[PDB]
């Protein structure tokens, strides 16, 4: 029901720009197979060499965000397409299509072994990482150019990254220009900063080591996104970053039942803003001196 | 009985820092516990250094290096600067 | 400047810290600037904590600092 019928990809009548030996996520078949990614007039095509029927076509009009993640501290280089409308790849509906290539290579030839050979292997691995990053970056720029300015190439700011649990594993969440992302592990996180209405920091209280971050979207029909188990050392940094991005935040000692709150807000959004809107998240509005000391 | 606590000094410091803020009694108990704890830590480490180096006097160097051991980077730097400034001005005066 | 705190521009008691360092069985002798240095450090640390506690109490629209804000 939510699969919008897309236009047909228009093949390029000349020699297309191509990226070879790429894996796709989600995989259209249970078998992981390397493919070739092609740039065409109105989109990109992934094509497996083993079966012609496992083609994945992505139109430029349907890409919302285009990310490039280099292989610096990771073992893989990535080209991620976040989509406006979800695509059917094999049996899975997905908003996210990732193209990646793992540099992980086994190098020790298990004649002599000693500190010179290991240093040469480490140098060869660094050269391979830098070559793959240059190849994928150039190809991602060529995708942005082929879009006629419809798609900007985003690169994550690693220095502004923080650790957290949006799903079931602890992962490094990375800010970009316009989005908060995690692309390394599946399931992927892509939060567009402009779609956020408010951020709530849960379990901010003295003696806890970790807090949770909740994103509420402007579209109240969209479920809230939780990023759990953020180290408290990152709290003041996250508050600063939310302020620098013009996102309002609130803090609370307790985890809220967002699934009840969002249903109340959906039932009457007008009455919600009439009362005061998001002000109820600021703990208790006593507005009076505590004067606990006698 | 005259019991000793750092409450008046914390009031002084607070008014120096936040003139329009007040402290509860329990927060003052916590602050007193904190001050006593830090004093105990620093004096014990200074004694440990003095015994390690076969000395029988606690001078400002032992306290300085104790602060260097206990506090983390920025905190240690600022607290060392503050202490040296205060000791220098007390000596000068 | 009679009190040793004044001669050092401090708010914590130099004399009490001196007495506690002496009547505390830490070392045979005590310097003259060790109490001053320690009082300076303690005052600095308390100011450091009270700044952030005041910030947190002001973010909760409260005039009184409570254990929650610490």
């Amino acid at each position: 029901e939510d699969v919008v019928a897309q236009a047909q990809l228009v093949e390029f009548k000349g020699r297309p720009k191509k990226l070879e030996n790429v894996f796709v996520r989600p995989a259209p078949d249970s078998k992981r197979v390397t493919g070739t990614l092609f740039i065409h007039q109105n989109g990109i095509r992934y094509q497996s060499p083993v079966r012609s029927d496992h083609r994945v076509d992505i139109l430029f009009s349907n890409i919302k965000h285009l990310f490039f993640q280099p292989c610096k501290e990771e073992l893989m280089v990535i080209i991620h397409c976040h989509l406006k409308t979800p695509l059917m790849i094999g049996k899975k509906k997905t908003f996210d299509v990732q193209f990646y290539r793992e540099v992980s290579d086994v190098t020790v030839d298990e004649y002599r072994y000693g500190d010179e050979d290991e240093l040469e292997q480490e140098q060869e691995e660094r050269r391979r990482k830098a070559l793959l990053d240059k190849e994928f970056r150039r190809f991602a720029e060529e995708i942005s150019e082929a879009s006629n300015g419809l798609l900007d190439l985003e690169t994550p700011f690693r220095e502004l990254g923080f650790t957290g649990v949006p799903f079931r594993s602890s992962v490094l969440c990375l800010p970009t220009r316009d989005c908060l992302i995690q692309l390394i592990d599946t399931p992927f996180l892509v939060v567009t900063l402009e779609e956020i209405e408010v951020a709530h920091l849960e379990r901010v209280q003295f003696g806890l080591k970790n807090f949770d971050l909740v994103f509420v979207f402007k579209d109240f029909s969209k479920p809230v996104v939780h990023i759990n188990t953020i180290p408290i050392e990152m709290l003041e940094f996250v508050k600063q970053w939310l302020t620098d991005v013009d996102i309002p935040y609130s803090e609370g000692a307790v985890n809220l039942n967002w699934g009840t709150i969002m249903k109340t807000i959906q039932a009457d959004p007008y009455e919600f803003f009439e009362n005061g809107g998001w002000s109820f998240l600021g703990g208790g509005e006593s507005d009076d001196e505590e004067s606990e000391e006698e | 009985s005259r019991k000793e606590s750092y409450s008046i000094y914390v009031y002084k410091v607070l008014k120096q820092v936040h003139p329009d803020t007040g402290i509860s009694s329990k927060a003052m108990g916590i602050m007193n516990s904190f001050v006593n704890d830090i004093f105990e830590r620093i004096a014990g480490e200074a004694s440990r250094l003095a015994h390690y180096n076969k000395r029988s006097t606690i001078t400002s160097r032992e306290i300085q290096t104790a602060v260097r051991l206990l506090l983390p980077g920025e905190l240690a730097k600022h607290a060392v600067s503050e202490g040296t400034k205060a000791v220098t001005k007390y000596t000068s005066a | 400047a009679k009190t040793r705190s004044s001669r050092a521009g401090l708010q914590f008691p130099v004399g009490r810290v001196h007495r506690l360092l002496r009547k505390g069985n830490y070392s045979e002798r005590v310097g003259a600037g060790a109490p001053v240095y320690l009082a300076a450090v303690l005052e600095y640390l308390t100011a450091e904590i009270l700044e952030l506690a005041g910030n947190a109490a002001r973010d909760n629209k409260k005039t009184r600092i409570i254990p929650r804000h610490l």
Binding site: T243, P248 | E82 | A47, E51
Partner: peptide, 26 residues
């Protein structure tokens, strides 16, 4: 520099942080 004037400066930048946050909620 001495630390008290930097914490005053940092906290005045934090008052601007709070003022921005108040403007964002309004």
């Amino acid at each position: 520099k001495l630390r008290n004037e930097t914490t005053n400066t940092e906290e005045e930048k934090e008052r601007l942080r709070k003022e921005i946050q108040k403007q964002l909620h309004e």
